[PDB]
């Protein structure tokens, strides 16, 4: 009855540190952090539990980060790509010599992620069980007319604050800005192709152009999810709250709203961090422009 | 691997400390849990994730950790609290 629960992106917001975000493994830990809470914030006795429910979710999102204990040294060696590529040290060190080196093995990282995926137990699934367990521990009468609290708590204390934060940063403008930056760097590439060709760091520009193009497509993809531009009627929360319904319906519709916040905050956390990385290496594109001493 | 002397049975008044020694490859990287044993009757969980309360169990019990040292720390003893209290932790080096 209750219908319970595709890329993987890598991130270097700063130059020096790297993390990855496994898209299924974040929506999951989001779904059941937006379910465990819903249950306890319906019932009065369970208002006591929210310290423990918080500290549970905290300690799951920490054991998860302990997987990044040995997907770390190879990550750091992957970072030493930037050492060889963009800042050749002491000015003296010199074509697809670094493109191959121990440097193709972005796949080495992707391996080590999948090497410790299901392996090492099931810290995901833990969140499923606990969120479901606390969803079982419910009361009210469960007659024809049950109370619609629960959802309204979580909305106005977690959701409604963040929706304003996103609408304030009009993403439609953000995309069109990023498009134009990419367009101009492509046009300059067209011309630099037609002109130059020695000690060729145009290939670096081609490479960084390529990298920033896919990163754009991801941010573009996430932004479309966050604001679709064909909508349920954007209302949904209003349909849920300030009413009474039968036990079956409300339980489905808790799980309904529990799903939305999973995928929403997934894409929106990613979008924000990807945007910080785009303009980290848009400034590194502009560092090469600062190396046009001519 | 872990160590623990048997004494949870003297109750004039105050809290109580159960210390727990260990090593790098066990306490140092892994999350500790704690259990109470009423003699000749099923054991019960109090603390998991180093310090978190099971649904029903009192806050008087509390776990802790500092490097290669952990401790269970009860506060406000009772007749019920006189028992045997054991811990649970994993050891990466010997795998068990």
């Amino acid at each position: 009855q209750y219908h319970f629960k595709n890329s993987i992106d890598i991130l270097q917001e700063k130059e020096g540190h790297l993390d990855f975000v496994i898209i299924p493994h974040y929506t999951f830990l989001d779904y059941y952090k937006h379910l465990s809470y819903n249950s306890i914030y319906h019932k009065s006795s369970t208002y006591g539990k929210c310290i423990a429910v918080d500290a549970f979710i905290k300690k799951i999102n920490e054991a998860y980060d302990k997987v990044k204990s040995k997907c770390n040294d190879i990550k750091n060696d992957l970072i030493a790509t930037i050492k060889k590529l963009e800042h050749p040290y002491d000015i003296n060190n010199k074509f697809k010599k670094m493109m191959d080196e121990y440097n193709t093995k972005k796949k080495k990282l992707i391996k080590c992620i999948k090497n410790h995926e299901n392996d090492f137990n099931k810290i995901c699934m833990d969140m499923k069980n606990y969120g479901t367990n606390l969803f079982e521990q419910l009361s009210c009468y469960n007659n024809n007319f049950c109370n619609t609290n629960g959802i309204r708590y979580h909305y106005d204390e977690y959701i409604h604050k963040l929706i304003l934060s996103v609408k304030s940063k009009n993403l439609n403008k953000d995309l069109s800005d990023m498009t134009n930056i990419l367009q101009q760097s492509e046009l300059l590439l067209t011309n630099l192709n037609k002109k130059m060709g020695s000690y060729i760091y145009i290939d670096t520009i081609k490479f960084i152009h390529k990298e920033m193009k896919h990163i754009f497509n991801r941010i573009e993809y996430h932004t479309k999810i966050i604001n679709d531009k064909t909508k349920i009627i954007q209302d949904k929360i209003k349909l849920n709250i300030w009413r009474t319904f039968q036990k079956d319906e409300l339980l489905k519709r808790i799980l309904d709203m529990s799903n939305e916040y999973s995928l929403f905050i997934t894409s929106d956390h990613l979008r924000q961090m990807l945007y910080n990385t785009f303009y980290s290496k848009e400034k590194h594109l502009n560092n090469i422009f600062h190396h046009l001493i001519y | 691997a872990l160590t623990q002397p048997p004494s949870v049975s003297e109750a004039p008044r105050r809290r109580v400390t159960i210390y727990c020694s260990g090593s790098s490859s066990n306490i140092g990287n892994n999350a500790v849990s704690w259990y109470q044993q009423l003699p000749g009757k099923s054991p019960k969980l109090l603390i998991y994730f180093d310090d978190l309360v099971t649904s029903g169990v009192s806050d008087r019990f509390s776990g802790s950790k500092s490097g290669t040292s952990a401790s269970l720390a009860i506060s406000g003893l009772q007749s019920e609290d006189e028992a045997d209290y054991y811990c649970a932790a994993w050891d990466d080096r010997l795998n068990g």
Partner: nanobody
Amino acid sequence: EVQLVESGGGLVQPGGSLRLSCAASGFTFNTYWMSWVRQAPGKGLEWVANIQQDGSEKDYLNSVRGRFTISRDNAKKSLYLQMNSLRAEDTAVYYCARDNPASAVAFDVWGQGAMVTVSS
């Protein structure tokens, strides 16, 4: 209902076969981790083994390694523990431990227990 019902367990001569069991209901057995824990008379607790929701991972201690065999049928909600080449150190009450929602070292609940004594 919080049910962990042991079946079997008894006495067999050194180097015997003995298969322990459990049953459960209410809490959906397939979705959660199980374990085994043992306690010898006049001795404290000792972890035996751990299993997965689909029996992907299996793990044991460092003495009965290869001897014991943890298994489960998740259609009938039933843990097992085939224990071959039995020794006398293996004298214990074998509790069908279940682990908590939170995967770790974490015996959520404990069954009544199966007395397994090993002697001539």
